[PDB]
Amino acid sequence: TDKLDMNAKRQLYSLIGYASLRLHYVTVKKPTAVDPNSIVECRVGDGTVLGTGVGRNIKIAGIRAAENALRDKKMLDFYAK
Numbered sequence: 001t002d003k004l005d006m007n008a009k010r011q012l013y014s015l016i017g018y019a020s021l022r023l024h025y026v027t028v029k030k031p032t033a034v035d036p037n038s039i040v041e042c043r044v045g046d047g048t049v050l051g052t053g054v055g056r057n058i059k060i061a062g063i064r065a066a067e068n069a070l071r072d073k074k075m076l077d078f079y080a081k
Helices: 008-016 058-071 073-079
Strands: 024-029 038-043 049-055
Touching: 008 058, 008 073, 024 058, 038 058, 049 058, 058 073
Parallel strands: none
Antiparallel strands: 024 038, 038 049
16 A cells, blocks of 8 residues: 655645745665665755655655655745745
8 A cells, every 4th residue: 555645746846846945856765676665855955854755666755755744834834934
């Protein structure tokens, strides 16, 4: 079971994706034969991390990362100014 909201990125970007904020996904552990997990962070320009995701590929990881950013309401409150 690998349950996942395919709109998370789109939904997060729509709330807090100002151009001035430089919201970006960065792969911080790319998967390997020795370790298949992918870990991705959803970041703003000044480096602060909003969401971290993990799963079998980068795309699925980067989606959980937003899924997770969306669940943090103090963070959303702040970054929608």
